[PDB]
Design a protein around this ligand. Structure first.
Ligand SMILES: [Ca+2]
Ligand SMILES: [Mg+2]
Lengths: 183, 213
């Protein structure tokens, strides 16, 4: 407690054994035989483990280009050039840079934004995800990819992921939306 | 998808391999003995039934060999020699591996049946004849007031014979289950939702007390 808030602080835990996910939180209704991705701590983004990544073998085979899509995002924009400069053993070389290479700063990133206030709040006030998607893309170039919604609606702080909802999916004023964004 | 586990796969393979080879070899001997030998114009023959051949092969592959029934054609005898060299190896390896698989079964599975108005205490951690005997002789001691509390041991192991004797001496008020408090399914079996307390005993004589803690 910090009364001088406890479970309100956001955690992400790397797990060595995916079965230990059941110990991370209370009132999960734990089972030993649910796969990690179904468990409440993973659905909330409070837990992670290596076992969710091993399908990247088969995705790297079936579409190489799609693995570069993930990495551009997940590394924040590492490149074969940067990987080679590090493999040259000299350490990460840097300094002041030209306007020509600084053009790479204007690139897309993943961001998370709230429907509680600002121009998009009109959709949190009883609109639908399809309305929000089209409006944000048209007015801002903001491309919505999913929701981060409170698990319970009334008292806990936990939220869960909803990848790419249907167009008629109802929104809440407390929702946050994951967005691809350019500034 | 029904044959789910490696031991059930091995079990069904052993049993059905044995039975199919035994039934096949019994038919083969039945053909040879009832045929009679071709070298003697089929005059040397025996009128065995298939069931007598099936019995005789069991009696020979087990190496009992009563000789109440035996082969008398030269083909049936040379078949019995080939059969002896092969099937003694099968019987002497298969029957112990069947007995091993049937022996490797949990004897303290199942679930605590909560009696209508009695209390129970779950006990776990370092459970052994030394820890349990010292615990029970203080917990169930006659100088305490008479209270009906059941003790429910939960441990990931089979009791040693000394502990199994001690559990049987307290059969009316002590119960034991295979399992671990690390599994929600085992905690449900011991009915811990409505236990009065859980006691976690420690190995005071472990090689390192931080791994034990
Ligand atoms: Ca839990
Ligand atoms: Mg009882």
């Amino acid at each position: 407690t910090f009364d001088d808030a406890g479970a309100n602080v956001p955690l992400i835990t790397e797990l060595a054994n995916d079965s230990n996910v059941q110990f991370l939180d209370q009132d999960d209704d734990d089972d030993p035989d649910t796969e990690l991705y179904m468990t409440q701590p993973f659905a909330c983004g409070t837990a992670f483990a290596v076992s969710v990544l091993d399908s990247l073998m088969s995705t790297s085979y079936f579409n190489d280009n799609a693995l570069t899509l993930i990495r551009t995002l997940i590394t924040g924009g590492a490149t074969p050039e940067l990987e080679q400069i590090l493999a040259e053993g000299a350490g990460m070389r840097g300094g002041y840079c030209s306007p020509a290479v600084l053009a790479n700063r204007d690139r897309c990133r993943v961001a998370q934004i709230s429907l509680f206030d600002g121009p998009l709040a009109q959709f949190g006030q009883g609109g639908h995800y399809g309305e929000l998607f089209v409006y944000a893309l048209r007015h801002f170039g903001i491309l919505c990819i999913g929701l981060y919604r409170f698990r319970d609606t009334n008292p806990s702080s936990k939220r869960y992921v909803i990848t790419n909802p249907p167009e008629d999916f109802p929104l809440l004023p407390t929702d946050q939306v994951y967005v691809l964004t350019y500034k | 998808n029904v044959l789910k586990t490696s031991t059930l796969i091995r079990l069904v393979q052993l049993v059905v391999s044995f039975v199919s080879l035994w039934l096949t070899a019994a038919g083969f001997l039945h053909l040879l003995e009832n045929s009679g030998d071709p070298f003697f114009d089929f005059g040397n023959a025996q009128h065995l039934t298939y069931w007598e051949c099936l019995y005789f092969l069991m009696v020979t592959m087990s190496t009992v060999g009563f000789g109440d029934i035996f082969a008398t054609t030269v083909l049936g005898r040379t078949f019995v020699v080939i059969f002896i060299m092969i099937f003694i190896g099968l019987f002497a390896s298969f029957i112990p591996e069947i007995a091993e698989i049937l022996g490797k079964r949990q004897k303290y599975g199942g679930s605590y049946k909560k009696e209508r108005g009695k209390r129970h205490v779950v006990v776990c951690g370092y459970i052994t004849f030394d820890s349990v005997s010292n615990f029970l002789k203080d917990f169930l001691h006659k100088d305490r007031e008479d209270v009906d509390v059941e003790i429910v041991f939960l441990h990931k192991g089979l009791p040693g014979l000394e502990l199994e004797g001690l559990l049987k001496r307290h059969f009316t008020q002590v119960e034991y289950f295979w399992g671990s408090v690390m599994d929600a399914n085992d905690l449900e079996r011991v009915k811990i939702q409505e236990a009065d307390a859980c006691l976690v005993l420690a190995n005071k004589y472990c090689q390192d007390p931080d791994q034990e803690d």
